[PDB]
């Protein structure tokens, strides 16, 4: 009886640069802003799921 199992895997990552998003005073896209304005104050699963 002879058994030979060999798994040699490599995961190499070379990062170009890092990015950090701002936390305050974020300007949203006009489409997302319209969609937010188009959401009613009453709970509606359809519109929220679409969003």
């Amino acid at each position: 009886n002879e058994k030979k199992f060999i798994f040699t895997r490599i995961f190499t990552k070379v990062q170009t640069a890092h990015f950090k998003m701002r936390k305050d005073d974020i300007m949203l896209d006009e489409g997302m802003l319209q969609s937010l304005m188009e959401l009613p104050d009453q709970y509606n699963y359809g519109m929220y799921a679409k969003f």
Partner: protein, 49 residues
């Protein structure tokens, strides 16, 4: 006249063989600075330099 004979024989043979081999290798690289094409060339894990 009376003639009688007796014979007996036995043979035993046992063989055992064991072979075990193991080898592993690891590599760790940590480079900071100039993440351009040349450092990607140097990021070659197989060749050391």
């Amino acid at each position: 006249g009376v003639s009688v004979g007796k014979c007996r024989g036995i043979l035993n043979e046992i063989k055992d063989r064991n072979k075990r081999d193991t080898m592993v290798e690891d590599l760790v690289v940590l480079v900071r600075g100039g993440a351009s094409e040349h450092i990607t060339t140097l990021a070659y894990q197989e060749l050391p330099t």
